[PDB]
Coordinates of C-alpha atoms and ligand atoms in Angstrom, one line a residue:
Chain E
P1 CA 90.0 94.8 82.8
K2 CA 86.9 95.8 84.6
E3 CA 85.7 97.6 81.5
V4 CA 86.3 94.7 79.1
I5 CA 84.8 92.0 81.4
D6 CA 81.2 93.7 81.1
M7 CA 81.5 94.7 77.5
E8 CA 83.9 92.3 75.8
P9 CA 89.4 87.6 75.4
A10 CA 91.2 90.5 77.0
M11 CA 94.2 89.2 78.7
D12 CA 97.1 88.2 76.4
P13 CA 97.2 84.3 76.3
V14 CA 101.0 84.1 76.2
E15 CA 100.7 85.5 79.8
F16 CA 98.0 82.9 80.5
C17 CA 100.3 80.1 79.5
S18 CA 103.2 81.7 81.4
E19 CA 104.2 80.2 84.9
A20 CA 103.7 83.6 86.5
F21 CA 100.0 83.7 85.9
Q22 CA 99.3 80.0 85.9
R23 CA 100.7 79.0 89.4
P24 CA 98.7 81.7 91.2
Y25 CA 95.6 80.8 89.2
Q26 CA 96.3 77.1 90.0
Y27 CA 96.2 78.0 93.7
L28 CA 93.3 80.5 93.6
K29 CA 91.1 78.1 91.6
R30 CA 91.4 75.5 94.3
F31 CA 91.2 78.1 97.0
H32 CA 88.0 79.9 95.8
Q33 CA 85.8 76.9 96.5
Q34 CA 87.0 75.2 99.8
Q35 CA 88.8 72.3 98.4
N36 CA 91.6 70.5 100.3
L37 CA 95.1 71.8 99.4
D38 CA 96.9 68.5 100.5
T39 CA 97.6 67.3 97.0
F40 CA 100.5 68.8 95.1
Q41 CA 100.1 71.6 92.5
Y42 CA 102.1 73.1 89.6
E43 CA 103.0 70.1 87.4
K44 CA 104.6 72.5 85.0
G45 CA 101.7 72.8 82.6
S46 CA 98.5 74.7 82.1
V47 CA 95.4 73.2 83.8
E48 CA 91.9 73.5 82.2
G49 CA 91.3 77.1 83.0
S50 CA 90.1 80.0 80.8
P51 CA 91.3 83.6 80.5
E52 CA 87.9 84.8 81.7
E53 CA 87.9 82.7 84.9
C54 CA 91.5 83.6 85.9
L55 CA 90.8 87.2 85.1
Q56 CA 87.7 87.0 87.4
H57 CA 89.7 85.5 90.2
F58 CA 92.4 88.1 89.9
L59 CA 89.7 90.9 89.9
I60 CA 87.9 89.5 93.0
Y61 CA 91.0 88.8 95.0
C62 CA 93.2 91.7 94.4
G63 CA 91.0 93.9 96.7
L64 CA 90.9 97.2 94.9
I65 CA 87.8 98.1 92.9
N66 CA 88.9 99.3 89.4
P67 CA 92.5 98.2 88.8
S68 CA 94.7 98.7 85.8
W69 CA 96.5 95.7 84.3
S70 CA 99.8 96.7 85.8
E71 CA 98.3 96.2 89.3
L72 CA 97.0 92.8 88.5
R73 CA 100.3 91.9 87.0
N74 CA 102.1 93.0 90.2
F75 CA 99.6 91.2 92.4
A76 CA 100.0 87.9 90.4
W77 CA 103.8 88.1 90.3
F78 CA 104.0 88.8 94.0
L79 CA 101.8 85.7 94.6
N80 CA 104.1 83.9 92.1
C81 CA 107.3 84.7 94.1
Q82 CA 105.6 83.8 97.4
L83 CA 104.2 80.6 96.3
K84 CA 107.5 79.6 94.6
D85 CA 109.2 80.2 97.9
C86 CA 106.4 78.1 99.5
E87 CA 107.2 75.4 97.0
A88 CA 111.0 75.6 97.4
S89 CA 110.9 75.3 101.2
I90 CA 110.6 72.2 103.1
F91 CA 107.4 73.0 105.1
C92 CA 105.3 71.4 102.4
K93 CA 107.7 68.5 102.5
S94 CA 107.4 68.3 106.3
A95 CA 103.6 68.6 105.8
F96 CA 103.8 65.6 103.6
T97 CA 106.0 63.6 105.9
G98 CA 104.2 64.7 109.1
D99 CA 100.5 64.8 108.2
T100 CA 99.7 67.2 111.0
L101 CA 100.8 70.5 109.4
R102 CA 98.0 70.9 106.8
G103 CA 95.7 73.8 106.3
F104 CA 98.6 76.2 106.5
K105 CA 98.5 77.4 102.9
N106 CA 95.1 79.0 103.3
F107 CA 96.8 81.1 106.0
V108 CA 99.6 81.6 103.6
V109 CA 97.6 82.8 100.6
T110 CA 95.3 85.0 102.8
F111 CA 98.2 86.7 104.5
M112 CA 99.8 87.4 101.1
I113 CA 96.5 89.1 100.2
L114 CA 97.0 91.3 103.2
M115 CA 100.7 92.1 102.5
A116 CA 99.9 92.5 98.8
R117 CA 97.2 95.0 99.8
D118 CA 100.0 96.8 101.7
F119 CA 102.5 96.7 98.8
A120 CA 100.6 96.6 95.5
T121 CA 97.5 98.6 96.4
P122 CA 97.0 102.4 96.8
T123 CA 93.4 103.5 97.2
Chain O
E1 CA 104.3 139.6 52.3
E2 CA 106.8 141.6 50.3
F3 CA 108.0 138.4 48.6
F4 CA 104.5 137.4 47.6
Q5 CA 104.1 141.0 46.3
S6 CA 107.4 140.5 44.4
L7 CA 106.2 137.2 42.8
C8 CA 102.8 138.7 41.9
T9 CA 104.6 141.7 40.2
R10 CA 107.3 139.6 38.3
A11 CA 105.6 136.6 36.6
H12 CA 103.2 133.9 37.8
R13 CA 100.5 131.4 36.7
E14 CA 97.2 133.1 37.1
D15 CA 95.3 129.9 38.0
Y16 CA 96.9 129.4 41.4
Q17 CA 95.2 128.1 44.5
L18 CA 96.7 129.7 47.6
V19 CA 94.8 129.0 50.8
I20 CA 95.8 130.6 54.3
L21 CA 94.5 129.4 57.6
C22 CA 95.0 131.3 60.9
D23 CA 93.7 131.1 64.4
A24 CA 90.7 133.5 64.4
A25 CA 91.3 134.6 68.1
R26 CA 94.9 135.8 67.4
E27 CA 94.0 138.5 64.8
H28 CA 96.0 141.5 66.2
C29 CA 99.2 140.1 64.6
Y30 CA 100.5 140.9 61.2
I31 CA 99.7 138.3 58.4
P32 CA 95.8 137.8 58.9
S33 CA 95.5 141.7 59.3
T34 CA 97.4 142.6 56.1
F35 CA 95.6 139.9 54.1
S36 CA 92.2 140.8 55.5
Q37 CA 90.6 141.9 52.1
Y38 CA 90.8 138.2 50.9
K39 CA 88.7 137.0 53.8
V40 CA 86.5 134.0 53.0
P41 CA 83.6 133.9 55.4
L42 CA 82.5 130.2 55.3
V43 CA 85.3 128.2 56.9
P44 CA 84.9 124.9 55.1
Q45 CA 84.4 121.8 57.3
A46 CA 83.8 118.1 56.6
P47 CA 82.1 115.8 59.1
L48 CA 84.1 113.3 61.2
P49 CA 83.4 109.9 59.6
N50 CA 84.1 111.3 56.2
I51 CA 87.5 112.3 57.3
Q52 CA 88.0 108.9 58.9
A53 CA 87.0 107.1 55.7
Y54 CA 89.2 109.4 53.6
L55 CA 92.3 108.8 55.7
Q56 CA 91.5 105.1 56.0
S57 CA 91.1 104.8 52.3
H58 CA 94.5 106.3 51.6
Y59 CA 96.1 104.3 54.5
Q60 CA 94.8 101.0 53.0
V61 CA 98.0 99.3 51.8
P62 CA 97.0 97.1 48.7
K63 CA 97.8 93.4 48.7
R64 CA 100.9 91.7 47.2
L65 CA 103.2 94.5 48.3
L66 CA 105.0 92.8 51.2
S67 CA 104.1 95.3 54.0
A68 CA 104.3 95.0 57.8
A69 CA 100.7 96.4 57.8
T70 CA 99.2 92.9 57.1
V71 CA 99.2 92.1 60.8
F72 CA 97.4 95.4 61.7
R73 CA 93.7 95.8 60.7
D74 CA 94.1 94.3 57.2
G75 CA 96.8 96.6 55.9
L76 CA 96.2 100.1 57.2
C77 CA 100.0 101.2 57.6
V78 CA 99.3 103.6 60.5
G79 CA 97.8 102.9 63.9
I80 CA 97.4 104.9 67.1
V81 CA 97.2 102.8 70.3
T82 CA 95.6 105.2 72.9
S83 CA 93.9 104.8 76.3
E84 CA 92.1 107.1 78.8
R85 CA 94.2 105.9 81.9
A86 CA 97.8 104.8 81.5
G87 CA 99.2 101.4 82.1
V88 CA 96.7 99.0 80.5
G89 CA 97.5 97.2 77.3
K90 CA 99.4 99.4 74.7
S91 CA 103.0 98.3 74.5
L92 CA 102.0 94.6 75.0
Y93 CA 99.5 95.1 72.1
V94 CA 102.3 96.4 69.9
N95 CA 104.5 93.4 71.0
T96 CA 101.7 91.0 70.0
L97 CA 101.6 92.6 66.4
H98 CA 105.3 92.3 66.4
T99 CA 105.2 88.6 67.3
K100 CA 102.4 88.1 64.8
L101 CA 104.6 89.7 62.2
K102 CA 107.2 87.1 63.3
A103 CA 104.6 84.3 62.9
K104 CA 103.4 85.1 59.3
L105 CA 106.3 85.8 56.8
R106 CA 108.6 83.2 58.3
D107 CA 112.3 83.5 59.1
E108 CA 111.5 86.8 60.7
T109 CA 114.5 88.9 61.9
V110 CA 112.1 91.9 61.8
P111 CA 113.1 95.1 63.5
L112 CA 110.9 96.6 66.3
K113 CA 112.2 100.1 66.5
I114 CA 111.2 101.9 69.6
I115 CA 111.4 105.7 69.7
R116 CA 110.6 107.1 73.2
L117 CA 109.6 110.7 73.0
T118 CA 109.9 112.1 76.5
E119 CA 110.6 115.8 76.2
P120 CA 108.2 118.7 76.5
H121 CA 107.8 120.9 73.3
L122 CA 108.3 117.9 70.9
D123 CA 111.4 118.3 68.7
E124 CA 111.1 116.6 65.3
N125 CA 114.9 116.6 64.9
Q126 CA 115.0 113.8 67.6
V127 CA 112.7 111.5 65.6
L128 CA 114.5 112.4 62.3
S129 CA 117.9 111.6 64.0
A130 CA 116.6 108.3 65.2
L131 CA 115.3 107.4 61.8
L132 CA 118.2 108.6 59.6
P133 CA 120.5 105.5 60.2
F134 CA 117.7 103.1 59.6
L135 CA 115.9 103.2 56.1
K136 CA 118.8 104.8 54.3
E137 CA 120.2 101.4 54.0
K138 CA 118.0 99.5 51.4
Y139 CA 118.3 96.2 53.2
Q140 CA 115.8 97.3 55.9
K141 CA 113.2 97.9 53.1
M142 CA 112.0 94.5 54.4
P143 CA 109.0 95.1 56.7
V144 CA 109.8 97.0 60.0
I145 CA 107.4 98.0 62.7
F146 CA 108.2 101.5 64.2
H147 CA 106.7 102.3 67.6
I148 CA 106.9 106.0 68.4
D149 CA 106.0 106.4 72.1
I150 CA 104.8 109.9 72.9
Ligands
ATP201 N1 96.0 92.2 78.5 C1 96.9 92.0 79.4 N2 96.9 90.8 80.1 C2 97.9 90.7 81.1 N3 98.9 91.4 81.3 C3 98.9 92.6 80.6 C4 98.0 92.9 79.6 N4 98.3 94.1 79.1 C5 99.4 94.5 79.6 N5 99.9 93.6 80.6 C6 101.0 93.7 81.5 O1 101.1 95.0 81.9 C7 102.5 95.4 81.9 C8 102.7 96.6 81.1 O2 101.8 96.7 80.0 P1 102.0 97.6 78.8 O3 103.4 97.9 78.6 O4 101.3 97.1 77.6 O5 101.2 98.9 79.3 P2 100.9 100.4 78.7 O6 99.4 100.6 78.5 O7 101.7 100.5 77.4 O8 101.6 101.3 79.8 P3 101.9 102.9 80.0 O9 100.7 103.7 79.7 O10 102.4 102.9 81.5 O11 103.1 103.1 79.0 C9 103.3 94.2 81.5 O12 103.9 93.5 82.6 C10 102.3 93.4 80.7 O13 102.7 92.0 80.6
MG202 MG1 103.6 101.5 77.3

């Protein structure tokens, strides 16, 4: 993907409309710029993103320099399972009912970047 | 050698075009040594894009034929999906051509035969044995993609 982002979209769009790429991109798009994460995400549909922009976010947040597509797929699916577990648990519900829990999902996504660097990143 | 000698003794057409090609650095063996008087010192070679255009001109499937090649690069019947480093886009690309053959020519039911070749010193009997129960049937002469994976 690094060699078709300077020369040449490239990612398969059936993966772009998949849940497994869209939910991590719907969090990383709101996470790149420092927007507030209080409002709820994943309304089960694709937001206005492009394959170029979500490819660029996955290239800049996976950590390693020249990845293959398997490694970005593993990174995105790991973030998918973790944010799906974050959406299935009641900590976002208790954040909605308590209103002093917020800002914890920046910690959540950053610490999955570190654990994902442990799991899905040699070199 | 003695059989070629027998055929040139008995009876043969004297307009025949027999060409032999051997590795030049393996000359101490039998057949390039005992045919050395018919040595042709030019070694005919064509350039690369001429060979590419020749093979592509014969691989070009004509229209109105109901081929699976119409979802490849406008009917070329043979492709090779290669890459320098492994694990990038190849099998998903083959799957996108298979779903594109599912889109055009509706009511698809089209076979995607996958033939994983995973043994050293490639055995053609494996590929032949995987292909014999398949197009000896006459109802699978509908368009099928085959994906040999060396
Ligand atoms: N362009 C792409 N965009 C997104 N995901 C992709 C892309 N290409 C491949 N993938 C993902 O990568 C994984 C494996 O891809 P694929 O089977 O095409 O790789 P490959 O090049 O054939 O692999 P290998 O050389 O290991 O056999 C799958 O999960 C697939 O969804
Ligand atoms: Mg593959």
